[PDB]
C-alpha cells in the first residue's frame, strides 16, 4: 500500500548553474530533502514503499531500490556515482515510473509519483510525455509536481490530467516544509486537509515541424495534427 | 558554449563532500514562517474570500451586468464577423469603416455607464468587460498597419 | 483514421411513443440510451458536431442547433422528456430541415442524418423520392434505426443514401444499435486552444468548461490534451522479439537494444504506447 515514486530532476547543467550562483541552496541541500521526505514516506505505514529515479542528461537511474540507515546509504553512493544535449528529458524518467508501479503492483496498492523539477521544460519531447500521462490517469496514478523557479507548462497538465496537486514554492531552502505539507498524506487523507489550489493551467500544444507552443493555430479534419500558421495541405499522409 | 563546461565541472567536485542530515535540512525561522503561508490568512486569498461583492447585494448590478453582457456581445458579433472576411471589397470596408464609429461610440456609452454604476460604492470589478472592447480596439489598428502593408 | 462528422440525430415525437415494450415510456427510454449515446459519441470523435430535431404533428422543429457542445444536447434531452407527443411525425420535413443547414457544410466531412424512427407512418406534404436523388447528391448518409416494424420508405431511404437499418428486439439490442454509429468511417480548421482555465484567444471572450466554439468571434475552441490522446495510431510502435535485469522495471527492443521483461512487454505496447528507451 501507499508506493511512491519520487522523480527529482538531476540536471546538472542547472544545479551547477546555481552551485555558483552562491544561492545557498545546492543538490546536496536538496537530494537530502527527498532523502527526509523518503524517510518519512517510510513511518506513516508499516507496509509502504519508495523509489527514487534521478533525471541526469541522457540518463535516468534508479536511486533507491538498487532500516533507513540501508534506505539512504544507497542514495547517497548513487549521487555519488551519476554526478560525475543542454535540456533535461523528464518523460524518459516518468516512462520508468510507470514500468515499477505496473510491476510491484503485480506482486499484490495505490501509487503516486512525486516530480521535483528544477530546470525549464523542454518541448521537444511533448509528443512523448502526453502518452505517460493518459497511461497514468488509466490507472489512478497521482502526478504531483513542486517546481523550484519557473512554471513547467507540461507539468500543470500531468496534475490536472490525473488529478495531482501542482504547488510552486516561493523559497528554496524551506522546500522540506512544503514537501511535508502538501505531498506527504496520501490519496485518502488528501480529502480531509486543505490544500493550495491549482491557479492556472497552460493548455497549448506544439506544431508537427516546429514543436512551438501555439495558442492559435490550425488542425488537420482527419490526421489531428496541430500546426502553424501556414494550412496548405495535410504534411503527414 | 562556455558556462556549460564548467557548470558541468563546478557540479562534478561538489558531489564528493555530502549527506549532512541533522540541521542542514531546515531552519526553525524559515520553517515557522511557512506556517504563515499556507494558512487561510497567508497566500490564500482566495480562500479568504469565495463570492465577488458585486458593488452591492447581486441582483440589481447583476441585471445590468448582464445588459452590459448583451450591449457588448451583440456588438461585436457583428464586428468580428466582418473582420473575418477579408473580402478585399469596398462594401466590406465600408462596413468597417460604419464599424469603426460604433465600436468607438460603445467605448463612451460604456465607459460612462461605468462611471456611473461604479461610482457609488467602486467596489466592483468592471475591467473584465474592458478587455473586449480593447481587443476590439487594437484590432482596427494591426488592420489597418495591415492594409497599409497590403497596399 | 476516422474524419470529420456532422451528425443530426432525428427524434420522433408521434402518438405512438407512449407505448409500452421498453422502459414504460417509449419516448424516455429514447432520451436515456440518447443522453449515452451523446457522451460516447464524442470522446471517440474530438471535433464533431452534434444536432438534434424532433418531428411532431407532420412538422420538425430544431430542439438543438449543430454545435460541438456535449453538455448543450445533454441539458436539452432532459428538458424534453415530458413532450407531448400528439399527432404523426414526418419524414420529408425533418430531412428538409436536416439537408437545408447540412448542405453548406464543407467537403471534407462526413455528413450523416440518424433517425430514431417509432411511428409506422409519414404523413407529409410532397413526395418522398425526390429527397433520396436529393439527398444522394448531397452525398449525405442516412441510417434509420426503427421501432416494432420495417417500413418500405426506410429500406429505400437507407441503401439509396448509403446508411443502415435496422429493427430493435429489445432495450438491450436498442444499446448495441447505437454503439455501432459512435465509431467515424475510414483540410485544415483553425481552432484557437484555451490557456488559462477556460477563456477565449480570439477575443477574450471568458466563458464556462466547455470545449464549444466561440460564441462571438465564431472560432473553435477545443482543448489540446483531448487531441493528444488520439495519436500514436499514427507512427504506432512496432512488436518486439523475445528468446532478468530489465531497463523498464529494473528486475527485446530492436530499434535501441533494450531489454524487457515480459511485464513490460505487455504494458508498453498496450498502455504506454512508446518506448522508454527510445525517448532517451
Ligand atoms: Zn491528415
Ligand atoms: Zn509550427
Ligand atoms: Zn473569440
Ligand atoms: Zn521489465
Ligand atoms: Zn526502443
Not at chain 1, 544507497?74 to 549521487?79: G, N, P, R
Not at chain 2, 460603445?106 to 468587460?129: D, G, W
Amino acid at each position: 500500500l501507499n508506493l511512491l515514486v519520487i522523480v527529482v530532476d538531476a540536471n546538472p547543467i542547472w544545479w551547477g548553474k546555481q552551485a555558483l550562483k552562491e544561492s545557498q541552496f545546492t543538490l546536496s541541500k536538496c537530494i537530502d530533502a527527498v532523502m527526509v521526505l523518503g524517510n518519512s514516506h517510510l513511518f506513516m505505514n508499516r507496509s509502504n514503499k519508495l523509489a527514487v529515479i534521478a533525471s541526469h542528461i541522457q540518463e535516468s537511474r534508479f536511486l533507491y531500490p538498487g532500516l533507513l540507515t540501508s534506505a539512504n546509504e544507497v542514495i547517497v553512493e548513487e549521487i555519488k556515482d551519476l554526478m560525475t544535449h543542454t535540456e533535461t528529458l523528464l518523460a524518459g524518467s516518468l516512462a520508468k515510473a510507470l514500468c515499477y508501479i505496473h510491476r510491484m503492483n503485480k506482486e499484490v496498492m495505490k501509487s503516486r509519483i512525486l516530480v521535483i523539477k528544477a530546470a525549464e521544460d523542454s518541448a521537444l519531447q511533448y509528443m512523448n510525455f502526453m502518452n505517460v500521462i493518459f497511461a497514468a490517469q488509466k490507472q489512478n496514478i497521482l502526478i504531483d509536481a513542486c517546481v523550484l523557479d519557473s512554471d513547467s507548462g507540461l507539468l500543470q497538465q500531468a496534475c490536472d490530467i490525473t488529478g495531482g496537486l501542482y504547488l510552486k514554492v516561493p523559497q528554496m531552502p524551506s522546500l522540506l516544509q512544503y514537501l511535508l505539507w502538501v505531498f506527504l498524506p496520501d490519496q485518502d487523507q488528501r480529502s480531509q486537509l486543505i490544500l493550495p489550489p491549482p491557479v492556472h493551467v497552460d493548455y497549448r500544444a506544439a506544431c508537427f515541424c516546429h514543436r512551438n507552443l501555439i495558442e492559435i493555430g490550425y488542425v488537420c479534419s482527419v490526421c489531428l495534427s496541430i500546426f502553424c500558421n501556414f494550412s496548405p495541405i495535410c504534411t503527414t499522409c | 558554449s562556455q558556462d556549460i563546461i564548467n557548470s558541468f565541472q563546478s557540479i562534478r567536485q561538489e558531489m564528493e563532500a555530502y549527506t549532512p542530515k541533522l540541521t542542514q535540512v531546515l531552519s526553525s525561522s524559515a520553517a515557522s514562517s511557512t506556517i504563515t503561508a499556507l494558512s487561510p490568512g497567508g497566500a490564500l486569498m482566495q480562500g479568504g474570500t469565495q463570492q465577488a461583492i458585486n458593488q452591492m447585494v447581486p441582483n440589481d448590478i447583476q441585471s445590468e451586468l448582464k445588459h452590459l453582457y448583451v450591449a457588448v456581445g451583440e456588438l461585436l458579433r457583428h464586428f468580428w464577423s466582418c473582420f473575418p472576411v477579408n473580402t478585399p471589397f469596398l462594401e466590406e470596408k465600408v462596413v468597417k469603416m460604419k464599424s469603426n464609429l460604433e465600436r468607438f461610440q460603445v467605448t463612451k456609452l460604456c465607459p460612462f455607464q461605468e462611471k456611473i454604476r461604479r461610482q457609488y460604492l467602486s467596489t466592483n470589478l468592471v475591467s473584465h468587460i474592458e478587455e473586449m472592447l480593447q481587443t476590439a480596439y487594437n484590432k482596427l489598428h494591426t488592420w489597418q498597419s495591415r492594409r497599409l502593408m497590403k497596399k | 483514421l476516422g474524419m470529420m462528422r456532422h451528425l443530426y440525430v432525428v427524434v420522433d415525437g408521434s402518438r405512438t411513443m407512449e407505448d409500452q415494450d421498453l422502459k414504460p415510456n417509449r419516448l424516455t427510454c429514447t432520451l436515456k440510451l440518447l443522453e449515452y449515446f451523446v457522451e460516447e459519441y464524442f470522446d471517440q470523435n474530438p471535433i464533431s458536431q452534434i444536432g438534434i430535431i424532433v418531428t411532431k404533428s407532420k412538422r420538425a422543429e430544431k430542439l438543438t442547433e449543430l454545435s460541438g457542445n456535449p453538455r448543450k444536447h445533454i441539458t436539452s434531452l432532459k428538458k424534453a422528456v415530458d413532450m407531448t407527443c400528439h399527432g404523426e411525425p414526418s419524414l420529408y420535413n425533418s430531412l428538409s430541415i436536416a439537408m437545408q443547414t447540412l448542405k453548406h457544410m464543407p467537403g471534407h466531412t462526413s455528413r450523416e442524418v440518424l433517425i430514431i424512427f417509432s411511428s409506422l407512418t409519414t404523413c407529409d406534404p410532397s413526395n418522398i423520392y425526390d429527397l433520396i436523388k436529393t439527398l444522394k447528391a448531397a452525398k449525405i448518409r442516412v441510417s434509420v434505426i426503427g421501432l416494432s416494424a420495417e417500413v418500405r420508405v426506410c429500406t429505400v431511404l437507407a441503401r439509396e443514401t448509403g446508411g443502415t437499418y435496422h429493427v430493435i428486439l429489445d432495450e438491450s439490442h436498442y444499446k448495441e444499435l447505437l454503439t455501432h454509429h459512435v465509431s467515424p468511417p475510414p483540410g485544415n480548421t483553425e481552432p484557437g486552444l484555451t490557456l488559462g482555465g477556460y477563456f477565449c484567444p480570439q477575443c477574450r471572450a471568458k466563458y464556462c468548461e466547455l470545449p464549444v466554439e466561440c460564441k462571438i468571434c465564431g472560432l473553435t475552441l477545443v482543448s489540446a490534451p483531448h487531441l493528444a490522446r488520439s495519436y500514436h495510431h499514427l507512427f504506432p510502435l512496432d512488436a518486439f522479439q523475445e528468446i532478468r535485469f530489465c531497463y523498464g522495471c529494473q528486475g527485446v527492443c530492436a530499434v535501441c537494444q533494450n531489454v524487457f521483461c515480459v511485464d513490460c512487454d505487455v504494458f508498453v505496447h498496450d498502455s504506454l504506447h512508446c518506448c522508454p528507451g527510445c525517448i532517451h
